[PDB]
Amino acid sequence: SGYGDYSYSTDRTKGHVNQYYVDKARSRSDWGNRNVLPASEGDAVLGRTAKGAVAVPEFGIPQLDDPVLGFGPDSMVDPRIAEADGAVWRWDAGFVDESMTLASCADISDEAVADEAF
């Protein structure tokens, strides 16, 4: 069908309904009255994070070349990482909720819950 191909499914646009109070962000005055915040990093302001900070290149230089000492694939995740980016508050975009995660449901290989179940 080609590259630039129209689909109703992929049309997030108010062209089929004429809601004329909805437009692309444009003026500097638009941040106070109509627009809220980018919902992802592709929609972010040029060269800044989704929250408005300058984007930094995400990775450093590994000190301490060592398999037993030194950071590796076995190292545990420091809890202050999620605190630094603000993912620990429920009003943050990256706030994880584990109550509806697939990981929270019961294993079925476990014989115990299976016989409890049948």
Partner 1 sequence: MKTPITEAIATADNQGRFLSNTELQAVNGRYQRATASLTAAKALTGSAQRLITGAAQAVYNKFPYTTQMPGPAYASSAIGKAKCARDIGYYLRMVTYCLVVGGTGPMDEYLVAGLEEINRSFDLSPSWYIEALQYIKNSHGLSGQVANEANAYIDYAINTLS
Partner 2 sequence: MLDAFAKVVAQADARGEFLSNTQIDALSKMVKEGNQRLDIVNKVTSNASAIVTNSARALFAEQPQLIQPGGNAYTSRRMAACLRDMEIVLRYVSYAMIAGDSSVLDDRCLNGLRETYQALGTPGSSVAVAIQKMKDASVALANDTTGTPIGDCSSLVAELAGYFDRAAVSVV
Partner 3 sequence: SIPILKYSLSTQNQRVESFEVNPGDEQYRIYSTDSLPSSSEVDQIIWAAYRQIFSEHQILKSTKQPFLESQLRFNQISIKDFIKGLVLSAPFRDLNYNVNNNYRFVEICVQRVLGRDIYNEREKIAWSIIIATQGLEGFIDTLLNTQEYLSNFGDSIVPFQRRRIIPQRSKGEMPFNLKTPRYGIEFRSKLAATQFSWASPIRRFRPQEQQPKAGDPALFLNMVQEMGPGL
The answer to the question of residue 90 lying near partner 3 (CB under 8 A) is no
Q: How many residues bind partner 3 (CB under 8 A)?
A: 28
Alpha-carbon gap, residue 20 to 18, rounded angstroms:
6
Residues 39/93, Cβ–Cβ less than 8 Å = yes
78 or 107: CB nearest partner 1: 78
Alpha-carbon gap, residue 96 to 114, rounded angstroms:
29
Give the interface with partner 1 as residue ranges (CB under 8 A).
61, 63-64, 66, 69-70
Partners of residue 54 on adjacent β-strands? 48
Alpha-carbon gap, residue 113 to 76, rounded angstroms:
30
The answer to the question of residue 34 lying near partner 3 (CB under 8 A) is yes
Alpha-carbon gap, residue 116 to 118, rounded angstroms:
6
Q: Which does 108 bind (CB under 5 to 8 A by kind): partner 2, partner 3, partner 1, none?
A: none
40 or 63: CB nearest partner 1: 63
**Given the rule CB under 8 A, which residues bind partner 3?**
12, 21-22, 24-28, 30-31, 33-39, 42-46, 79-80, 83-84, 88-89
